[model samples]
Target chain A: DVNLYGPGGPHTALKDIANKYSEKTGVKVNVNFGPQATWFEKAKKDADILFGASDQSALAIASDFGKDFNVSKIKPLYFREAIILTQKGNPLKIKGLKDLANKKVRIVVPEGAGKSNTSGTGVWEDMIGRTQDIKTIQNFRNNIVAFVPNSGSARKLFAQDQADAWITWIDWSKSNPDIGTAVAIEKDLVVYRTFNVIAKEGASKETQDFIAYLSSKEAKEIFKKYGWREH
Target chain B: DVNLYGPGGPHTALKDIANKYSEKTGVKVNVNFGPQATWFEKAKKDADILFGASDQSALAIASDFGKDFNVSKIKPLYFREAIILTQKGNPLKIKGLKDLANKKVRIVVPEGAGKSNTSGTGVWEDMIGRTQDIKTIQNFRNNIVAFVPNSGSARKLFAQDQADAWITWIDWSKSNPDIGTAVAIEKDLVVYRTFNVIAKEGASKETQDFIAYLSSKEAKEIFKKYGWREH
Candidate 1:
């Protein structure tokens, strides 16, 4: 049996891959998904692989458990592009991040943009923070009406009529056509994050093998189904 | 805030609807999904709404907590049809349950079929057991070489090439296109189960309202996307 832990955002894909790997080897892969707090303590005791929602989270575990657990090896697996969502049929004519800069536009962003463990922790800012466009960044910031704790919350806020625009990952917007139509962020300004897998320095052969399977084409297809882009 | 507890099978759709509800009402809906053991204790402490993966699970909760927790009301929300999966493209030429009677067929069934709380419990037998066709049922039983604990495990077993066929819910097979080609069970022999929401007798208005919302067209649409059938 292999133990894998991570936040819920990429859970569906990871579990699919885990099961696929298990099927090939007849080994059991137990995946625990939720907020880090729910399973981190237990992970410290038994996790064979730790998945990060983003680089910051990956660094967090690396720094926190490096000494005792030897969990310092990081393998960047898949990248997900961040995209904007607008009311259905593009009612607001939200073409891209520029449209969100309008003072009248109400926008919903993933919470903890400055720093946090959530996948969207710094995602919203990452899109506009680059490009060095102060005008668009500041204006878009002003239009922010809600900071949702997760993508699901943002979807609800958008569906319940709280915000006219939302910034979330490509898969989220694509999966939720009922809530909003996904609008691609401009190429140069677009931001994406790598979901990484961390392994202990002396991880067992089985753990290492499972990690290798995650990068295989079979695994990539599972991630792709959930809107992840391959590098 | 509304607290919901259930297995992972329905987590995605339920969380979607929960967010949609919270968006409209501005109430927070926290959904915790996994094996019951992970959250049942917490549910006993504070779950506002309990979701059952199947009728057996619902009955388990009602029997276990009805008196002390006041969790007596069960409102069946949605139904899902059970289907068979074969190696992609039906390489084994498995058309339906009848096809599994071949003595050479190797089948993977969900564990805990006779009893216990997994969703697939008694599901296999239920399909053939009802037919009173002892020959087909016994032959199918003879072909069962593995009993996996959960659907994911079954997928792994099938994918690993351990089994040629799998029986699981329509949504699971539909979601995992790479694993197998789904074959519909004959309508008369098809088995379906209701996912119910159990609330306390004196549950707060918020909880009651959320339960009511679950049966609404809006909520049903969310469930439908996950392959649930509307009554």
Candidate 2:
């Protein structure tokens, strides 16, 4: 039996895989989905298998989550590219990242760890980089009406019409129709991120088989069925 | 060359696939992603492979759009299940369909052409069908604060904090982190809808090949990456 902790995004897919894998191998697969930020710590607590957000390795290793395993132990599972969310019809006529600076439009942004940290930072910095002029970034910042906590909150602000635009995953913007609409960011500015499954060091042979099962075509199809891209 | 028009959400993946098909087979595939409603008209006008929103386009076949194409020619390419969205903390603690009636919670609903119609209708019928309680259903409807025109608009209401919860797709809520969270409706009540590649009658051999290519694992993978599902 293996206990797998995953993020909410692919939780359904993982559950489907676990059920099928159980039927095929007679090994129980327990999967729990939760927030990405706490996945690392929870994995350290007891989870034999961990699956979640992009670049969590360094974040895990550098944090109190502790006892970093060899990076090689990390195996990638899925990925998604960044997207822009706007009100339906895009009343602001927001075309791209450059348009976020439009004084007429309000910006709903994620509260990043800092000025140049993660994708949250990438969004803000990229916009600043896109325009080149500091005044443009400042003017864009001036229009910042909401600073949400994370990706979900950032999206929440956009959904509620609290703000005019949000930087989010492309698929996300498309999936929720009553929410608003998604507009693609420039190809050069896209931030495609990966999700990986992390196995604790020296886990059991059964765990290896479970991971191998996840890497199988059968498991991959389930992930695809649930809108997860196998990396 | 084939001109494929799809919804904004799946456009990028289609573009990626088109590029690969172009390289592997020397056939140019030009793809444009537009609003859901326009897809039907454009399909009649020119699109070799037309795709759009779940049921409306399907509904349009019998009512709106053109009668130029045969309905049987519409082949389902991808699909997904519907879900509900709430703010990050789920501040209202909405557990399921029945929970939408909480007086403290305001509903952000999509406008249905009729009570039994498309996107908006799907949620109500599915919920009412699940509960089999007319009063319960009516009570739930009483809380609706906003009647949105599209999925995008409905989400806009939530993002702006105009409403407490919105019925949408699981992937959308999942992909958007800061937006809030997804609450799965009853598994039995799930509304899994499809987007078909509607081919005009007498489409060329190249168009057939393109459609076949899209049906293949390669194309499905691209769709999976972009949050589309194969039922």
Best by lDDT: 1
**Ten-residue region with minimum lDDT total, candidate 1 chain A:** A111-120
Q: Against the hidden true structure, what lDDT does model 2 obtain?
A: 0.59
Model 2 residue runs over 4 Å out of place are A1-231, B6-16, B19-26, B36-44, B61-67, B114-120, B174-178, B226-231
**Candidate 1, superposed: residue stretches over 4 Å from native:** A1-231, B66-71, B113-115
Write out the backbone clash pairs for model 1.
A23-B156, A23-B160
Clashes of 1: 2
Clashes of each: 2, 34
lDDT of 2 by residue, A109-188 (tens): 65332111122422343323333343454455556676554566676677678888887654454346557767776654
**Weakest 10 consecutive residues, lDDT, candidate 2 chain B?**
B113-122
* Candidate 2 CAPRI classification by DockQ: incorrect
Query: Which stretch of 10 consecutive residues in model 1 chain B shows the poorest summed lDDT?
Result: B111-120
Q: Model 1 over residues B171-211: C-alpha lDDT tens digits?
A: 77645567788889876556666666777656788988898
